[PDB]
Amino acid sequence: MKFETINQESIAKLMEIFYEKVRKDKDLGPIFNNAIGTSDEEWKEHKAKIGNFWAGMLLGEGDYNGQPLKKHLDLPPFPQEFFEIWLKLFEESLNIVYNEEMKNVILQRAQMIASHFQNMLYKYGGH
């Protein structure tokens, strides 16, 4: 009932579950909607792309070829606190799809990226 492995099937289930939580989210939903659209197909094309990102990260295969940091830099600014929401929802989704062992491998990878995005996107300083 829970994946003890990482494959196209498990990642596709992860994308389904996570981006449905994101779409329904009070804080994240508008950001994503303003960026990709509201149609089911636009959301399917986004899940496909992020699915390819994760396959490249986790399986070493797929057609993801974009610049993830640049993309988030180019987004209209949003609060740093949203990274907490994103991670909470992602961990919930992983907990549905994967056993504890696999879940923790992928969460760790997401945490590392989120931490890198945050150090790059917010000074936390002043100027």
Q: Binding site: what residues are annotated?
A: 64, 72
The CA–CA distances, whole Å, from 16 to 26, 45, 115 equal: 18, 12, 24
Which member of 12, 29, 31, 42 binds ligand HEM (CB under 6 A)?
31
Three-class DSSP category at 98: strand
Q: How far apart are CA 3 and CA 25, in angstroms?
A: 25
Q: Is 66 in the site for ligand HEM (CB under 6 A)?
A: yes
Which member of 20, 23, 29, 36 binds ligand HEM (CB under 6 A)?
36
What residues contact 51, with CB distance under 8 A and at least 6 apart? 8, 11, 12, 15, 62
Which member of 53, 94, 97, 98 binds ligand HEM (CB under 6 A)?
53
Structure tokens at 74: 């180019």
Q: Using CB under 6 A, which of the segments 7-15, 49-57, 92-100, 119-127 binds ligand HEM?
A: 49-57
Where do contacts with ligand HEM occur on this chain (CB under 6 A)? Answer: 28, 31-32, 35-36, 49-50, 53, 66, 68, 71-72, 75, 78, 82-83, 86, 110, 113-114, 117
